[PDB]
Design a protein around this ligand. Sequence first.
Ligand SMILES: *C\C=C(C)/C=C/C=C(C)/C=C/C1=C(C)CCCC1(C)C
Length: 217
Amino acid sequence: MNLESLLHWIYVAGMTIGALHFWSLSRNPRGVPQYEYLVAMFIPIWSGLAYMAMAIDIAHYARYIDWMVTTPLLLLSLSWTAMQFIKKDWTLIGFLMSTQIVVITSGLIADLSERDWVRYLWYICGVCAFLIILWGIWNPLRAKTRTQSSELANLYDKLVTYFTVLWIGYPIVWIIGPSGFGWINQTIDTFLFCLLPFFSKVGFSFLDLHGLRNLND
Ligand SMILES: *C\C=C(C)/C=C/C=C(C)/C=C/C1=C(C)CCCC1(C)C
């Protein structure tokens, strides 16, 4: 077992603990609907399975297969919170989810590209779709909370801020690593793509679920 495998196994352990915790919280919902708990559970499970595949075995292909599903689901979770006490705007949710999938597919194509100018154009395409995502969660999605209690609005603002900071790190690590300029080696790249995802998946859902539950103290 090399360092990369070890890092991936620790990540899998993290996902497992996270999943078990959300499952336990769902048994005592405290005012939060089960669908929010189920998505919170599915995300780390899907990611953990993907990383388990890499731990056992372009490089890190499965990481893109993880993001393909988990990123749109994280937006689904974020969207539900924004519309916690109102009717779910499914068209807005679909827009955000599909647009995020474009981010991931653009990233994969870029990584699969043989020509550097082509690779970077697709990277740019992904960043543009990503900017649309940021615009979405900060405007139309954020506006939804303003039609509700200030308590919800304040919770959403903290979550979307946490959400945004972490998400911005992904295109950064990608471009500085082997898929980009190569300022960092694969191992360091892997290490960063273990920490960020842990806080983005388990970390975000922890703050999201506990935040929603706490509003009902
Ligand atoms: C595993 C969980 C999350 C929230 C992963 C998010 C990943 C991204 C936002 C990735 C973005 C990329 C961009 C914007 C540009 C091309 C390369 C990436 C796919 C790394």
